[PDB]
Amino acid sequence: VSPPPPIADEPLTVNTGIYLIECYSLDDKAETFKVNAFLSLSWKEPEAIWIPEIRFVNVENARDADVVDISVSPTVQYLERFSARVLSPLDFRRYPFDSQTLHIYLIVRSVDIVLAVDLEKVGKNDDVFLTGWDIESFTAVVKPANFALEDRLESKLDYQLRISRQYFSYIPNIILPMLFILFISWTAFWSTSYEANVTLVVSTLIAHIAFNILVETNLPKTPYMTYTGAIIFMIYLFYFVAVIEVTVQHYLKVESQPARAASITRASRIAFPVVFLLANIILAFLFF
Amino acid sequence: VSPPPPIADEPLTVNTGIYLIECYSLDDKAETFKVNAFLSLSWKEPEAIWIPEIRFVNVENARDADVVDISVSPTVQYLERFSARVLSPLDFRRYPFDSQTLHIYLIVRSVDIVLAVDLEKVGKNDDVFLTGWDIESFTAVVKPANFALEDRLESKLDYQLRISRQYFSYIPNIILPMLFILFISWTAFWSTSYEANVTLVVSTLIAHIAFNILVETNLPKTPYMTYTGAIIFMIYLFYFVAVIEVTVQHYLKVESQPARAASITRASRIAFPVVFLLANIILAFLFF
Amino acid sequence: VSPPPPIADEPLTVNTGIYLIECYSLDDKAETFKVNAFLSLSWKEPEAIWIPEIRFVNVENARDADVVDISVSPTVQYLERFSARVLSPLDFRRYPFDSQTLHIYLIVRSVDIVLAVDLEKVGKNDDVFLTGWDIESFTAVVKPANFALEDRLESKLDYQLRISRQYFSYIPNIILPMLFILFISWTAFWSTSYEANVTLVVSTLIAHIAFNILVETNLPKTPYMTYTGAIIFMIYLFYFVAVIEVTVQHYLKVESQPARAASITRASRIAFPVVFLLANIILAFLFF
Amino acid sequence: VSPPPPIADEPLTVNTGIYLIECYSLDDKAETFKVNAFLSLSWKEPEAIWIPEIRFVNVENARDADVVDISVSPTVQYLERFSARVLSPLDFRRYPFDSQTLHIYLIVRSVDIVLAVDLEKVGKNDDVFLTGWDIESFTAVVKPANFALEDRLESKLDYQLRISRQYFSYIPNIILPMLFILFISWTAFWSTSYEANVTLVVSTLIAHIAFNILVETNLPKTPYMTYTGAIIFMIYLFYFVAVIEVTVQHYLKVESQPARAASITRASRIAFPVVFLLANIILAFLFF
Amino acid sequence: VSPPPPIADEPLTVNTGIYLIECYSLDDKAETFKVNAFLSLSWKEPEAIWIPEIRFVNVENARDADVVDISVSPTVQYLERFSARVLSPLDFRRYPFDSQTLHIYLIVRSVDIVLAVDLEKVGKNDDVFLTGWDIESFTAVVKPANFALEDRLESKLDYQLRISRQYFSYIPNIILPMLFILFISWTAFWSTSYEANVTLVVSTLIAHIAFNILVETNLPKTPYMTYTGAIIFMIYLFYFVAVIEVTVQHYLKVESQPARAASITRASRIAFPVVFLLANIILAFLFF
């Protein structure tokens, strides 16, 4: 009913480890993800011993805990399965090419301790390999500066999981068709008729708006300006410039200046591919 | 089991403070936001002392409370972590440029007290800086006139958080492309052919409706008339006026009055940019 | 632990009142709204006296109750805060111009009573003025005929809140742009070219379908035929009639009958504004 | 604390009845509907007698029960209000014209009984008339063959509610505008110009896709092939055939065969109304 | 209160079986499905005997359990109804033609056992036949290598349900109309006019984007590249190639090279049907 009294040091290094079991959800819009796994505590029946009530910080509602096995040994092991939605922000600074770092902050209440880690206990389960994500590093750090509101010194032993998106699907499902729509838009330049070029640019503008609807159905729409948030803006800019160019060409052609009209057509034709590649490169450099 | 009896004054100024931890959600459509933070009470084990059961007013369902640390001293500190969705209305009177003030009304039940504040305890955590929002002021006021239904005098010590939106993304993701669509619409004026101008205005009207779909996916659609709710209406007005102008121009051109047709084209061309800027300025002045 | 025995009359008129605090939600699609307020009971510590367990009828799940103040006096007052989603149907017979009446049916279990009201206790809080709605009347009625399944005579003392929508936003955000789309559609009549009139009517039909998408994002889509459900149908009817008229005009023009073609154009031009106004008036009279 | 021992027959015919109060929701997409009503048990204070714990089969999560009145008589009545989402599948074999039968399977645990019904107790409340639905029959059947996993003989006394949709709104809000779009599509036939007929058919194909979006916002999208799932397919078929017909007509007209072109136009004009009516009749006969 | 002590073997083969009752939901987007059925345990009143607390692994939140019948015999049967959302991933590698295998991992806590199966007890209920799915096999395997974090040897006796989609609706509701849109797109080739072919290809590109919206409303959008994720990409590729082909044809026709223009038209006309069939066959072979 009480922690083991006799020790010269006030804190006890109870080995705390976590091993993933199944990431039930990764809610981008809710900005949190639901994790369902079990944690192991080594402290050296539900009330067989004094269980250090190690709590969590980044938690929506009190973790759905369930003791699995509390083994004793001439120390004690304690593995408990739990499900909890962790309120870890993830910055969609680069949505199709991300390096999001999921955090779990574990803090232990103190009476009459200090959290620790176990190298063997921790580790993502190979059979629990995540769907659509890749794991780069899975470490733990004892940083006591995480919280400063409480006067008493407390150290939060957080777990960091660096995760990068599998991006071999987004290139052929989101980014590339926008380029195809833009390419159809440019193909208006080689044509001549106003009555055809106008529809071939504005109908494809309809196409781009609808396609942005299609992507938005999946995107989380962070308040930042995403890398997607810039390529979309660049495409709107280029559609506006293309409509301006075709209108100028027709204005010259009706005002009997065909030479400058042809010059503008040639310049735009050899420019927009080049200037768009340059602009995309500039945005990539800014979002490297 | 009882509050400390001997004091000449019926109320005790138990220091009540709150420090944010993680704003789990800001649900515009639900008109509430979910806050997960811990509150500290200074009153001068779960049942170690008499905990003043300070309750909240703006709460959906009873706050998910969890005691963190109840320290005693030769007064007593009591820090408790809690998660609660606060039912604080926020007026989207100016959606892209807002100054919304989140409220939390704390009231203490009285038997045989008066809420107070602690300057040091309160304060937004720097590491808990919100995503997509900026904090202007974080104050507390003891206003007993908040509720008048109960005859007994009670004072609600509310916390006010003034928050303004980071608007460097909405200008390049919502407002500006609508202007680009409208600009493409105007570019029909310099043209001449009816069979081209008609499609160049109505196809871009399709574009504007679809783009309003794209924004609506994000907007909360308050029953007010938002600043967005006016610019959208103004754009529909200008598309209707543009279609009227082009139809009149063609009606004159087929009725053999080319001079007035050219006059109308020139007037509209030099007018709609100017009149639209004037109208947007007028709406801005009305929504300053 | 027992109700006060000695009284010649079996029921006791415990004064029951409710004062709104914050209408947390008004879910049109769910057909229920979530109310968070406190109720006061005057019956002449949680177990200080015998609390008449007055229950509710229109409740999704058992009300989230919380006692606030149970005061005693040489009678007893009992104010309790609660949150509950009330399953009160609201008929969207006229969506932009509604008079929906929210109901709350309170019934008291009887052993060894009769519900009552307090004029002073009841009343909407001025600071709790609802967002996007207006209150016309807030009354209470003791109608024992509400339920007849139980043989024992019981009276349900329901509270009625008559609420009408603020409609100064829907006219400039929903109804009017549909009229603008229809007006653009009509503007095809003054034109002559088939290749232009066809696109100017069917592209704007695209516009109307997309705009109905935009409204549907907000509408609840009741199984009735709403007033919106009729104006939409009327607009589809008028687009079909307009396409029929333009096709007939072109069929006559290619069949070398220009006189009747011009006659039909003039008739339709002077008719559709008039006949549409008449039809909208007829629908308004039917939905007065 | 125990059932009444002395009776020669092991089961007791405790009269079980249900009367609806408010169908809180009918979730098509979730394939379940939430019912909030009270059930009455006649068995011949919460622990006043032995309450036969009659449970339900088609239940998502344990029914939210609440005892209302347990009356005793020199038998005993027991009316309890409850809210529960019942997992009753409903087959959208004919979405606009359905005859869906909602089921509620009640089974009584046996120790040391047999469920029964009461004609007077059961019955839909007239004031609880459902919104957008009509009730055809409300019966109860004791069919012990419902479940066979348990060796011990048990009879499930299910309640059946036959409900048919009010279809006076779907004809003027879903089915008819699709016909109007198709009619606009056909009106291309009487025209002659390719540059006009092509847009008048494919723009209206855009219209049909968008309108299917509008309906899909409401439909549940069952994995069957609905009657809607066939009319939609038929409309796509007819748009494809119409585009084929107009392309063939233009191919003949440019290949200098105007006679066969006119013949094809006349044949299609007099055919597609007739063949579409025949095809819709065939689908109706298949889905009678 | 304790397991039956005297047995030479530490584990007891308590027969564990599950029989489905109603699959309440199959949430593709949530990647989990909600099952509501009852499980039977044969171990050789709630506390009549020692119930082996067999827990589950793939569970969102602790299973909503409810004991149904705990029968004793001179062994003991124990049937308990439960509802639980199982976190079983399903790979949408082939969305319209899938072979998804739902898993349920059952593990028994050990003190002072080994899970087993019963051939008769297990089995899908015929009256509980799933809606929109077909069952191929329903087996159980004792594989102790499922989890390796715990040092103590434990065997998880998982149940596997192989389920394949009824695909007689997706072919006539999703795949085929995309082919119809593409066919309308190709029908532009036989035509000649640029002003007509351009609209007949880009308007139908609008159609394809909107139709992808319609399908996306139903699809779960897995991060893989689905078979749908390839046919969609192929259709965008073919629209881009078709626009390129028509623009090249018009560029040649205005540059006075009609012979090569006609040659390109004929080649594309006889190619795109053939090359598209070949490409779809190649994708099918890759996704066999």
Author numbering:
A (entry chain C), B (entry chain B), C (entry chain A), D (entry chain E), E (entry chain D): 5 to 48, 67 to 96, 99 to 136, 140 to 315
Excerpt from the paper describing this PDB structure:
To characterize the resting state of the prokaryotic pentameric channel GLIC, we first obtained single-particle cryo-EM data under resting conditions (pH 7), resulting in a map to 4.1 Å overall resolution. Side chains in the TMD core were clearly resolved, including a constriction at the I233 hydrophobic gate (I9′, 2.9 Å Cβ-atom radius), consistent with a closed pore. At pH 7, K248 at the loop midpoint oriented down toward the M2 helix, where it could form an intrasubunit hydrogen bond with E243. In simulations of the pH-7 structure under deprotonated conditions, the K248 side chain was attracted down in each subunit towards the negatively charged E243; similar to the starting structure, these residues formed an electrostatic contact in >70% of trajectory frames.
The extracellular domain (ECD) of each subunit contains β-strands β1–β10, with the characteristic Cys- or Pro-loop connecting β6–β7, and loops A–F enclosing a canonical ligand-binding site at the interface between principal and complementary subunits.
